[PDB]
């Protein structure tokens, strides 16, 4: 009874009010179809509740509460939209995940970690989640908007000098160190996921791939999850690794920022795959691109096999690398210092740093499509 009423209050709890209400809406959704409403039990339960449930539906946060400004992202299971909460006039970025496509495509469990990271990390390096809600169609994640854009954009609009690359690499390293210390492994670190704020400081997003480590600080996942150009060889070979798979992505990141291309870029999907697997022979810095001996050493320090990769022993071996020598910041204050690109913003809905961008079958027997999404509302 002690932990009972504590868990009804507790935001991390599966039996709090939002989850208890999720369970009721879900039950109503899943059952209200004449094909199933034939049943006396389904009918009397719907009779008693449909009127009240319809009333909560509107009393709770809806997609309807937001004016959809523009679409700033598009992923496997949905889109990211630039929105404004009608009542509060407050601007947020809202990520949408299609429930239909999460059932049709088998994967409908990644969002739990994604939500929890953003919701509770309370880290300058992690995009914050304010609200999480749902409807018959989607899963909605309301986040702190990042007007600075992503590092895909920054790279496309600039010739990135080593002074800038020093800063962004350092911010990514500390961001992944914060993710790691929460007992998490990103598995999908890439420029499309590195976002810039009002001040031009880095924050990570797309925590879908993320997995909780063992007591050993390792993960037993016999499936390759991530993006071609940035996947490490050990994760291609996984199809029992540590957090050093994220440092490999940092190597690729630095190489792309300096050279202008990814170090294993190929014509085909399997070509990149084969290039990565032969990194010892496929990786080479082009002559015309003037890369320092310190920048080359660090790309090479991460773009090796996991058994000798920099970071395998901790962040400290990364931090002390000669490449990070500068007259602008320290590992203890980068975020307090002025970023290389400070974004000029015309408005609170300025989306200039971002590029321009399903019907469930009515059942005849109980399916329970809403059940895997009970507890999502935060
Ligand atoms: O996870 C992201 N995109 C990937 C993505 C989007 C949609 C469905 C997906 C998916 O990935 C795999 C599953 O299906 C993401 C990108 C950018 C922001 C953001 C935050 C603040 N300000 C501006 C932008 C937030 C999240």
- Asked if residue 154 lies in contact with residue 160, where contact means CB atoms within 8 angstroms, the answer is yes
* Contact present, 99 and 137 (Cβ < 8 Å): yes
Cα–Cα distance between 113 and 372 in angstroms, integer?
14
Closest CA to 111 of 98, 122, 121: 98
Per-residue b/e over 311-329, b at no fewer than 16 CB within 10 Å? beeebeebeeeebbeeeeb
Helix (H, G, I), strand (E, B) or coil at 280: helix
Specify whether 188 is catalytic: yes
* Region at 158 (left for phi over 0; alpha for psi -120 to 50; beta for the rest): beta
d(CA 99, CA 106): 11
Helix, strand, coil tally for the chain in percent (to 5): 40, 15, 45
Give nearest CA residue, ligand 1 atom 25: 205
Q: Report the alpha-carbon distance of residue 256 to residue 189 in Å, rounded.
A: 13
Kindly tell me the burial class for residue 209, based on how many C-beta atoms sit within 10 Å of its own C-beta (0-12, 13-18, 19 or more): buried
Solved by what technique?
X-ray
Q: What are phi and psi of 220, to 5 degrees?
A: -95, 85
CA 69 to centroid of ligand 1, rounded, Å: 16
Task: Give whole-number Cα distances, 281 to 92, 253, 263, 342, in Å.
Answer: 45, 19, 11, 39
CATH of domain 150-344: 1.10.510.10
Domain extents in the chain:
1-149+345-378, 150-344
Angle CA(357)–CA(109)–CA(224) in degrees, nearest 5?
Answer: 75
Of the candidates 82, 85, 86, 99, the residue with the CA atom closest to the CA atom of residue 22: 99
Which token pair is 122?
């309370």
The CA-atom distances, in angstroms, between 101 and each of 75, 77, 130, 138, 140 are 12, 6, 25, 10, 14
Angle at 209 between CA 353 and CA 63, to 5 degrees: 60
Helix axes 244-259, 293-302, angle to 10 degrees: 140
* Distance from Cα 172 to the centre of ligand 1, integer Å: 17
Q: How far is the CA of 75 from the centre of ligand 1 (A)?
A: 7
**Secondary structure (3-state) at 170:** helix
Q: Which residues contact residue 250 at a Cβ distance below 8 angstroms, ignoring those fewer than 6 apart?
A: 169, 172, 173, 176, 189, 302, 311
List binding-site positions for ATP: 72-80, 95
**CATH number of 1-149+345-378, picked from 3.50.50.60, 3.90.1300.10, 3.30.200.20, 3.90.420.10:** 3.30.200.20
Resolution of the coordinates in A?
2.9
């Amino acid at each position: 009874q002690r932990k009972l009423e504590a868990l009804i209050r507790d935001p991390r709890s599966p039996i709090n009010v939002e989850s208890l209400l999720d369970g009721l809406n879900s039950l109503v959704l899943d059952l209200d179809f004449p094909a199933l409403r034939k049943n006396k039990n389904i009918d009397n339960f719907l009779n008693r509740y449909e009127k009240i449930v319809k009333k909560i539906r509107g009393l709770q946060m809806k997609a309807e509460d937001y004016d959809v400004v523009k679409v700033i992202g598009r992923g496997a299971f949905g889109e990211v939209q630039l929105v404004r909460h009608k009542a509060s006039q407050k601007v947020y970025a809202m990520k949408l995940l299609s429930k239909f496509e999460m059932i049709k495509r088998s994967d409908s469990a990644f969002f739990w970690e994604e939500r929890d990271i953003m919701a509770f990390a309370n880290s300058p390096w992690v995009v914050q989640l304010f609200y999480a809600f749902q409807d018959d169609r989607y899963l909605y994640m309301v986040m702190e908007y990042m007007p600075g854009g992503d590092l895909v954009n920054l790279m496309s609009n600039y010739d990135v000098p080593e002074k800038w690359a020093k800063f962004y690499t350092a911010e990514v390293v500390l961001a992944l160190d914060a993710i790691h210390s929460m007992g998490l492994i990103h598995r999908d670190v890439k420029p499309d996921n590195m976002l810039l704020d009002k001040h031009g400081h880095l924050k990570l997003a797309d925590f879908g791939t993320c997995m909780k480590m063992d007591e050993t600080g390792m993960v037993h996942c016999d499936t390759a999850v991530g993006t071609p150009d940035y996947i490490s060889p050990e994760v291609l070979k996984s199809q029992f690794y540590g957090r050093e798979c994220d440092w490999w992505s940092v190597g690729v990141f630095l190489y792309e920022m300096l050279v202008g291309d990814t170090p294993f870029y190929a014509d085909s999907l399997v070509g990149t795959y084969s290039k990565i697997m032969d990194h010892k022979n496929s990786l080479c810095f082009p002559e015309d691109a003037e890369i320092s001996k310190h920048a080359k050493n660090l790309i090479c320090a991460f773009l090796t096999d996991r058994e000798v990769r920099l970071g395998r022993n901790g962040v400290e071996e990364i931090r002390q690398h000669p490449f990070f020598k500068n007259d602008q910041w320290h590992w203890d204050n980068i975020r307090e210092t002025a970023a290389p690109v400070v974004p000029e913003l015309s408005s609170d809905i300025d989306s200039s740093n971002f590029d321009d961008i399903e019907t469930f079958p009515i059942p005849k027997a109980f399916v329970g499509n809403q059940l895997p999404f009970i507890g999502f509302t935060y």
